[PDB]
Amino acid sequence: MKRINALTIAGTDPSGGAGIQADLKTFSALGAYGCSVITALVAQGVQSVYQIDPDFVAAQLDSVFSDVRIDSTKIGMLANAAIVEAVAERLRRYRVANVVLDTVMLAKLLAPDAVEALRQRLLPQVSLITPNLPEAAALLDAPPARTEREMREQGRALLAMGCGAVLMKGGHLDDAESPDWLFTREGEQRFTATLSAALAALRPRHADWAATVAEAKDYLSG
Amino acid sequence: MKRINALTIAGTDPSGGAGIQADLKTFSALGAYGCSVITALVAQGVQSVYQIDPDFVAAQLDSVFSDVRIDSTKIGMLANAAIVEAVAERLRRYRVANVVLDTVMLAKLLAPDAVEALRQRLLPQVSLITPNLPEAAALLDAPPARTEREMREQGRALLAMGCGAVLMKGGHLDDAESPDWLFTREGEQRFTATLSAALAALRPRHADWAATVAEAKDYLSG
Numbered sequence: 161m162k163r164i165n166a167l168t169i170a171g172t173d174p175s176g177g178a179g180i181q182a183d184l185k186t187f188s189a190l191g192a193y194g195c196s197v198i199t200a201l202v203a204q205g206v207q208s209v210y211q212i213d214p215d216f217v218a219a220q221l222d223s224v225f226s227d228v229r230i231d232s233t234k235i236g237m238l239a240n241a242a243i244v245e246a247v248a249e250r251l252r253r254y255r256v257a258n259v260v261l262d263t264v265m266l267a268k269l270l271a272p273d274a275v276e277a278l279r280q281r282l283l284p285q286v287s288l289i290t291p292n293l294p295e296a297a298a299l300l301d302a303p304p305a306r307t308e309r310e311m312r313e314q315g316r317a318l319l320a321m322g323c324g325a326v327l328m329k330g331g332h333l334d335d336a337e338s339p340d341w342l343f344t345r346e347g348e349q350r351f352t353a354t355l356s357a358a359l360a361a362l363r364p365r366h367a368d369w370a371a372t373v374a375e376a377k378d379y380l381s382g
Numbered sequence: 383m384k385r386i387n388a389l390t391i392a393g394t395d396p397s398g399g400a401g402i403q404a405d406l407k408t409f410s411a412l413g414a415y416g417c418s419v420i421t422a423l424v425a426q427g428v429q430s431v432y433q434i435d436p437d438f439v440a441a442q443l444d445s446v447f448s449d450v451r452i453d454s455t456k457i458g459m460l461a462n463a464a465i466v467e468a469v470a471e472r473l474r475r476y477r478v479a480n481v482v483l484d485t486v487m488l489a490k491l492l493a494p495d496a497v498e499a500l501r502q503r504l505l506p507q508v509s510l511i512t513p514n515l516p517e518a519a520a521l522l523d524a525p526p527a528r529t530e531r532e533m534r535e536q537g538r539a540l541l542a543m544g545c546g547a548v549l550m551k552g553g554h555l556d557d558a559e560s561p562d563w564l565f566t567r568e569g570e571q572r573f574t575a576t577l578s579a580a581l582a583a584l585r586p587r588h589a590d591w592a593a594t595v596a597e598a599k600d601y602l603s604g
């Protein structure tokens with residue numbers, strides 16, 4: 161197997177359950193070399209006030225992109241708009257192949273101009289978004305989907321909006337055993353039942369997003 | 383084996399070779415559960431300018447110390463004096479058992495009041511420091527040691543200064559196969575040939591620092 165360098169750009173999790181820590185563990189478990197850029201603090205009550213220097217994120221980006229070839233990148237929480245701009249500009253200049261964006265910033269405290277910058281500058285540089293029902297609804301400015309039919313309608317609308325690929329996570333569906341739906345130019349796939357990092361790490365080892373999502377769900381199952 | 387929760391408080395390393403990333407990997411490899419608080423950016427040319435919000439470190443500390451019982455803690459680079467104060471105050475209030483301080487801030491850009499705060503507030507809360515020859519010399523305000531005799535003199539002077547335990551890393555000695563020297567109230571031990579994190583993770587599983595250092599060096603060897 162060839163060397164795959166995966167980069168996670170997300171919040172730090174002091175407990176290690178999520179954030180760049182869990183992303184790096186997932187990268188290593190799936191046979192990829194992991195780099196990380198901390199851009200926020202993952203929430204655990206509410207959070208206390210803090211800020212992230214965009215120059216701190218920029219120095220981290222200098223370190224990663226001067227040293228190794230980045231094959232794929234997961235993106236999570238970004239604390240402010242300047243950080244969004246810096247991430248989008250670096251990904252544009254280096255043309256990272258597979259960018260999976262966890263849309264946690266949607267439907268969530270955080271600055272609204274950060275979400276605006278995400279819409280304007282970062283989404284063009286993203287190969288795949290993995291929104292849940294509230295995040296997809298906020299991204300389309302539409303009522304949240306209640307059925308699989310509405311999920312597929314919204315996934316097709318997101319594809320038409322410009323996204324290269326969408327993985328609509330249906331867990332918020334009122335029906336138990338909620339499926340995920342993958343929408344790409346090659347079609348639509350239903351999936352039955354960490355995730356963004358697994359997708360980023362596994363995408364180079366496949367020819368499409370469908371097999372990538374399949375193997376990622378298999379790993380996340382056991 | 384009982385559950386041991388190790389906390390690393392140090393810089394983030396985007397490449398993963400050092401910093402909290404390598405500390406967490408060492409924690410997990412040595413059978414300890416790892417938490418992390420990012421307090422700086424590990425250097426890789428010189429570094430670009432950035433700052434770390436002390437409120438960001440404080441929010442991370444809130445997250446860690448509200449959730450799990452911390453048995454040991456490694457401390458690395460701290461970016462400014464306010465961060466040093468916050469770390470020292472939290473460790474004092476929670477009385478963390480085994481605090482291993484990597485003295486990278488000594489003999490190193492960084493604010494001098496950060497080093498002053500390290501001397502004033504943090505050193506009383508530290509169970510073990512692991513200085514190399516320049517760091518120990520700067521901590522004692524003395525010429526760097528050139529012989530093992532001078533190493534042991536400086537280790538004894540550091541013990542008399544108030545440190546509970548010192549691990550003088552002798553790698554900077556002009557003679558190859560440079561040894562390390564452990565100085566505690568129970569005596570002195572010579573050792574022949576990551577490290578701070580290994581010491582933090584392994585100290586709860588022993589009755590003294592000598593066996594801890596022995597097993598840590600054995601792990602770091604192979």
